[PDB]
Amino acid sequence: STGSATTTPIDSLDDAYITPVQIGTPAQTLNLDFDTGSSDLWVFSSETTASEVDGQTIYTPSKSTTAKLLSGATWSISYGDGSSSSGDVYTDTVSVGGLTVTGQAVESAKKVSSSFTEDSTIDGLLGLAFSTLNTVSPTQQKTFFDNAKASLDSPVFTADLGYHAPGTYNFGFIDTTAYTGSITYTAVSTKQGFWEWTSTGYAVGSGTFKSTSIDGIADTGTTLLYLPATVVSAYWAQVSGAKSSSSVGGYVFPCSATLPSFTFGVGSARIVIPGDYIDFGPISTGSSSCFGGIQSSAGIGINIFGDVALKAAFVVFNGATTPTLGFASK
Ligand SMILES: NCCN1CCOCC1
Numbered sequence: 001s002t003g004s005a006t007t008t009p010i011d012s013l014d015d016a017y018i019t020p021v022q023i024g025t026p027a028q029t030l031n032l033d034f035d036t037g038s039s040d041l042w043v044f045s046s047e048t049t050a051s052e053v054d055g056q057t058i059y060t061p062s063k064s065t066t067a068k069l070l071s072g073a074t075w076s077i078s079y080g081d082g083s084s085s086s087g088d089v090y091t092d093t094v095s096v097g098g099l100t101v102t103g104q105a106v107e108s109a110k111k112v113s114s115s116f117t118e119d120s121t122i123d124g125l126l127g128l129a130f131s132t133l134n135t136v137s138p139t140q141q142k143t144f145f146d147n148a149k150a151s152l153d154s155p156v157f158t159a160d161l162g163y164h165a166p167g168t169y170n171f172g173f174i175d176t177t178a179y180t181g182s183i184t185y186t187a188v189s190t191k192q193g194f195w196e197w198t199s200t201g202y203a204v205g206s207g208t209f210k211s212t213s214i215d216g217i218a219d220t221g222t223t224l225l226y227l228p229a230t231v232v233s234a235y236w237a238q239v240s241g242a243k244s245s246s247s248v249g250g251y252v253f254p255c256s257a258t259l260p261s262f263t264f265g266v267g268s269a270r271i272v273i274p275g276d277y278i279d280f281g282p283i284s285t286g287s288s289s290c291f292g293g294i295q296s297s298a299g300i301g302i303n304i305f306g307d308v309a310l311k312a313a314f315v316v317f318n319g320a321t322t323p324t325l326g327f328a329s330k
Contacts, residue, residue, distance in 0.1 A: 001151050002172035003099025007034065007161060010121040013281040014307060015223055017161055018121055019169055022095040023106055024064030030057050030123035034169055035221030036159070036195055036317060037304070039133040039143050040077050041094070042107035043124035044116075047087055052112050055120030061108060067092045068103075075107045075135045080222075080300065083115035089136055094144060096126075099171045101148050105134075105141035125221065128157065128317065133193035145171070145319060155319040159220050160330070161311040163277050179314035179328035184269035188323045192302075194219070195317055197325045199305075200267060202227075204235050205260030209270070216303030218315060218325055224280065225262075225273070226297035226304040235262055235278075235294050242292070248283050251292035255282055262294060264309065266327040273312040280308070 007017040018031035023043070030043055044053055046060040061067035068091045076086035087110035094104040109124070116122065127134070131142045149155045152172030160178050161167040168178070189196045194217040203209040214227065232251070236242040238260050242253035253259070259275035278293035293308040316326030 001099055001148075002153055002170070003095075003097040003148075004168060004170050005097030006166050007169050008166045009162070009164065010119070012164070014164060014311065016119070016122060017167065017220070017307070018123075019096070019126070021126060023059050024061065024092045025066040027095070028057075028059055028064065030059060031121065032124050032126040033122050033221060034126050034128055034159075035219070036128040037217060037219035037221045038077070038079065038125060039127035039129045039131055039193065040075060040107055040135055041105065041124070041126045041144055042075065042077070042085055042087070042109055044112065045087065045108040048109045049111055052117045054117050057123045059106065059108060061090045061092065061106075064092055066102070067106075070105065070139070073136050073139055073141075075137065077135045081115065083113045085109050085112040085116060087111065089141070096144065096169070096171065099148055099152075101144055104144055104147055105136060107136065128220070129195065130190050130193045132190070145317075148172075149319055157317050157319070159310055159315040159317065161220070161307055163274075163311050167311070174316065179330045181269075181329050183314065183316055183326040183328040184266045185316070185318065185324045185326045186266055188325050190323060194302075195323070195325055200265030202231055202265065203263040203270075204238055205275075209263065209265065211265070214264075214303055216297075216305050218305045218310060218317070220307065220310060222304045222306030223308070224292075224304075224306045225278075225294045225308040226300060226306065227294060228303065229296045229298050232294055232296045235260075236292065244296075245289075248289070248291065250295045252283060252289040253292060255288060255290040257290075264305075269327065271309070271313045271327050271329060273309055277308055277312055
């Protein structure tokens with residue numbers, strides 16, 4: 001089998017992408033943030049504290065004839081950005097772009113932190129990292145991809161995010177019309193539960209490529225590109241007026257600038273992120289300063305190839321027994 005669903009930016013800056021997901025019988029469609037950096041499929045629900053719901057579509061398991069309460073199972077997650085959520089677990093039929101998984105764990109939120117409440121466009125998350133990071137306790141649950149894996153024509157999923165435009169998540173197949181050149185695959189370490197790989201280096205604009213190993217994760221659930229301070233400083237040094245701001249929380253630059261591209265290595269292949277993708281957006285509407293799409297990973301503990309980087313490529317998350325990651329230009 002296969003599935004194909006369109007993913008859409010939630011706002012004019014691509015702060016996050018939402019993909020419609022069908023849950024239950026009859027279908028209840030919720031717009032979830034597909035996150036390759038986490039492994040819980042959780043939704044705003046009929047159990048969520050009313051004061052913490054502000055415009056989101058909720059999942060009501062009592063209205064689903066296929067919903068089954070997973071007795072004694074609870075979940076509680078805290079993300080790298082400081083946001084959190086928790087609640088109970090049901091199993092239900094979940095479909096993404098025509099691909100159906102029966103008995104998928106759907107984590108019904110009872111509580112969500114304020115960061116979630118204020119994003120009316122995000123009805124929950126659909127985790128696509130390895131199932132070893134799933135928070136369901138005591139019985140750890142599998143991700144939608146992990147459950148679908150055996151039934152798919154090929155055990156893979158692809159991310160094709162658009163810049164200020166819709167994109168696609170495909171399951172079980174590779175669309176050979178969606179990219180230029182070829183897909184270069186690279187090794188993945190599953191030791192930390194992430195799609196963790198090693199980039200072979202970088203270039204700033206038309207500069208000479210520097211061969212240097214950069215371990216990081218392909219994370220569709222992170223908005224920006226987070227790289228070592230050395231790399232990030234060499235990039236922003238090419239932009240007049242760029243500087244790190246403590247009030248904004250990172251590199252800002254004058255909105256008047258046209259930015260250089262940033263290239264990252266995938267084996268002997270090169271993915272070029274256009275300068276416009278790195279011009280993330282104004283720190284406020286009408287502001288003099290704009291927030292950088294490339295930021296330092298110094299306080300995080302891991303480098304993150306977030307949406308700024310992934311939207312420049314067709315990305316294959318290969319879930320075979322020994323997982324690999326593929327990148328193609330587009
Ligand atoms: N609620 C703050 C976080 N979110 C994250 C996704 O984009 C919008 C802002």
